[PDB]
Design a protein around this ligand. Sequence first.
Ligand code: FAD
Ligand code: FAD
Ligand code: SAG
Ligand code: SAG
Lengths: 499, 494
Amino acid sequence: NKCDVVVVGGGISGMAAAKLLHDSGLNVVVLEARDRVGGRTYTLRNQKVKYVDLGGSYVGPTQNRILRLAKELGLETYKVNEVERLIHHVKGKSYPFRGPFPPVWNPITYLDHNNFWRTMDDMGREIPSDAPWKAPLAEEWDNMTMKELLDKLCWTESAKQLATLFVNLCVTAETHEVSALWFLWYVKQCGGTTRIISTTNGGQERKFVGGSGQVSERIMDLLGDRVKLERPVIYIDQTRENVLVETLNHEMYEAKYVISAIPPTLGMKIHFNPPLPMMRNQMITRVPLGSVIKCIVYYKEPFWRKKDYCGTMIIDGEEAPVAYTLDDTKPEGNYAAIMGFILAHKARKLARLTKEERLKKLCELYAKVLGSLEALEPVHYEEKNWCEEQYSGGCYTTYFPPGILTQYGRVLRQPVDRIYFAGTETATHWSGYMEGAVEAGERAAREILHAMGKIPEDEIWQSEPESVDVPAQPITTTFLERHLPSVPGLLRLIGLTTI
Amino acid sequence: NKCDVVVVGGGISGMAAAKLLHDSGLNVVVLEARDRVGGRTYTLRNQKVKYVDLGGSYVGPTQNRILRLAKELGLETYKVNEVERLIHHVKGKSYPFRGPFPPVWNPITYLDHNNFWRTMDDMGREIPSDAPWKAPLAEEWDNMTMKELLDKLCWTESAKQLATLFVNLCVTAETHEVSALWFLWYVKQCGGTTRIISTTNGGQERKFVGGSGQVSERIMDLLGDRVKLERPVIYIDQTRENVLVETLNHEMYEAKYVISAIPPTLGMKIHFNPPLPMMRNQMITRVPLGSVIKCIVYYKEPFWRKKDYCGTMIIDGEEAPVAYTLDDTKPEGNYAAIMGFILAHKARKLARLTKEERLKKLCELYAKVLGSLEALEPVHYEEKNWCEEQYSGGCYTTYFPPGILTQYGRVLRQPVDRIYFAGTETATHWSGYMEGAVEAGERAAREILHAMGKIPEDEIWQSEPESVDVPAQPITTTFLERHLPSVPGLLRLI
Ligand SMILES: Cc1cc2nc3c(=O)[nH]c(=O)nc-3n(C[C@H](O)[C@H](O)[C@H](O)COP(=O)(O)OP(=O)(O)OC[C@H]3O[C@@H](n4cnc5c(N)ncnc54)[C@H](O)[C@@H]3O)c2cc1C
Ligand SMILES: Cc1cc2nc3c(=O)[nH]c(=O)nc-3n(C[C@H](O)[C@H](O)[C@H](O)COP(=O)(O)OP(=O)(O)OC[C@H]3O[C@@H](n4cnc5c(N)ncnc54)[C@H](O)[C@@H]3O)c2cc1C
Ligand SMILES: C[C@H](/N=C/c1ccc(OCc2cccc(F)c2)cc1)C(N)=O
Ligand SMILES: C[C@H](/N=C/c1ccc(OCc2cccc(F)c2)cc1)C(N)=O
């Protein structure tokens, strides 16, 4: 019943917040809706797979908070396989390559591709990580979808097609669904295009040995009976001296402060007394999560490696159910597997099928892309459609439709009396990721410590030392990448000389 | 505890559903979150105003269901004042006019304006009212915002400015916030551009004597203790023989079927067992309501009439807090008043001010537009910001951002086991309006009657006889309106 802080939600963000507060000597309770902790992370264990992440999985350089937390809990990472060649499959043919981006040989198409990535980062530099609505052209960019921006920016279909896949893969949403301002912010706050798309030296470099679910599980172990499972919060009352938090199973909790560590829109599942301020009231109806099915197909051996393919496939085209894959084989070389994402409208479309029907479609796609009949002989299959989850709303994260970020963005992490806001959506570095979950949970916890007079104001936001185990190489560009003209730039140069 | 049907929500839609079921002999209970019925309608009574609609108010020709229901409950209508001239205020000057559309004199601008309205209706003819996602170009139009469409269609700033006002006023949202497919559907399902924008012979022709709140209030009177106030629904369990509905104040209700008569997104406030199907689970996070403050300024006399102005003002420009007004004077000629809407981003922006600060800004605007110092001497003021309402989410209605209607639209009124869906958002004629609320509530009720084997399938959807009191004149066009070229059409001809 009585405690110092109630944390609503036992995902990584809520668990990180609770741990910090507990370590500081406060009495905390975590109220979790599900019969498990972890939220958008979920590690399944059985004999066929040993373990598999069906939710969040990848970590990499510059994600120092999640790496530090996991290390303290006794966890280790291993490198995702990128020894052999990557594949770009376009117009029904596969093209192997090395390096983070598929090579482009046509001079005009090359200029267009180069200008696309460059411009994404150029625009990003004008967007403050902690206040995207303060960008000089915030309103102009927010009033445009990513589809509109790509239509303007890409002078070739080749570039527009890859750019579209990039958006779909980053934020599990269609280009016409999302604000240009918000998407440009999203990429910039991860460190830019190269960092976000890279396996080696990027966001997909590593996974945790034994699964990411261990982060939330091991924190639960530390907290003991303080974590309450199957306690969905239904009601928060701030009209009295202590905050009252009610659960669906009829329990009452009393606290000095509350941390909301759930996806912003899931705040709708709670009835508030007094009512929320107008801006938050409407904000939480304007912020959907994306759509994705994560699918893992198991094989006897990692047969792709024999053909000098690492297992990474970038697959363009409406017909392909999966647009992106990575090798999901265990570090020991066993439980050979390919992980693939079914993205955005395809998650909606293909959800109609049976599990067996999806497995068949994936194997037939992989056989084509890898040019290997071996892909037609799976030994096992696991999948999770995150669109069906009442207490997630989708995956990976929340997207902002046109017009919303400028109008409502500033209230995302603004306290409401004694309620403070965590969750990855409120992070300023790797928001949308496990990293952002840690940043946000610890920041919200320190906001409360400051409110209690236990720490100074300058200690609310804290820097993180770089991991010694996962060093970060800097993002570099070549002279030609920096200075080569865009397509319209070249046309202007021609028009000028021919005058 | 035990009944035949639980109706969640006591707005016009829930009340209409409950009345139909009650009249058929079934035991109904209405669970309403607030301490009042009416929802997005709310009639305030006090000595200064007598009565005033702070929510939904206007009814007109072709809205036969709301007119019939109100008449049965003993209500009457009166005509909104449109005797004298309307005003279009643009670039700081007022231009009085007659007829539904402000006149345009520049020849190129005339062609652009004419083409805009015509094209809106042209596109609408290809959109089925009961299935907008079946339009031949559904995906193309759904993947575009109204801003993108207006940028393509309007060759003059004059037309684009008026078109933008039109969108803001219709759906209390910015042009860049909404799907083109959804907006074109919205206009078409009200009967087209002329019908939706007109006072005389259109959606704003009339108001109810005594206020629209009386519709929900008088149905509550009929139902007696069957309406439960301050019972927000928190939990619906369909895992057992009878459906279980739990409220925030700890009560349990047991029923054969449930009608959800709340805005689609407000379904998020209910925890479901078993969980909702995937498509509905995500749909209810993708469908926000618009933003509006409704403001009524009172004066000693309807002084604008002396200058041959009816009180209608169409006001363009960022600086103006209010883009549209109507005369809100009582039919008896007393309680003189001007009703105005603060729309979309302006509702967000000006909410920061005090009530007194908004009153001053409105009076100064009205003095400018009406060219009358009398506008600076208000006797009273009432306002309501619908953005603050936990159990509405906004007003007037739900809008669809780009991409949503095609992907999720088909599940809007699809039953989930024993839950059926009412609410104006599920209507096929005047969805967004009180009329749509009645259509949807009665249809959802008849879906349950059919499920119980009490009526045949062909009786679920029922036509409505035309009101004898509010006859509808047909929408007409002239030869020149039909056949004059667009701006690019004229350029092609040259
Ligand atoms: C398929 C998939 C792929 C992705 N891959 C990666 C990846 O590779 N790398 C990466 O870093 N991130 C990835 N992500 C995203 C990552 O998982 C999230 O960013 C992160 O887990 C979010 O943590 P959170 O604590 O902020 O929120 P959540 O994990 O959503 O936690 C919120 C918790 O609150 C609970 N809750 C909800 N409502 C209530 C209520 N009313 N009362 C009580 N409790 C409630 C929920 O049950 C949940 O446990 C992926 C996610 C998925 C699903
Ligand atoms: C300022 C304004 C101007 C508009 N003007 C007009 C106009 O001129 N003409 C016109 O026709 N229409 C107008 N509209 C729109 C019109 O009011 C609506 O279309 C109509 O009232 C909707 O009725 P409804 O029953 O479908 O939904 P609602 O009126 O929203 O009713 C839903 C009810 O459900 C309740 N509820 C919500 N959640 C729960 C819960 N969890 N448990 C139990 N109950 C719950 C709510 O409290 C509410 O009473 C306007 C509205 C406003 C606010
Ligand atoms: C699962 C999620 N990953 C996001 C992600 C985002 C972008 C990615 O880009 C891959 C890529 C490579 C080459 C070209 C291209 F367009 C995209 C790959 C993954 C995460 N790590 O949380
Ligand atoms: C309040 C809401 N009314 C919607 C409405 C919609 C459109 C309207 O258009 C007025 C108008 C007139 C002339 C030109 C123009 F662009 C708009 C007026 C009102 C309703 N009746 O529910």
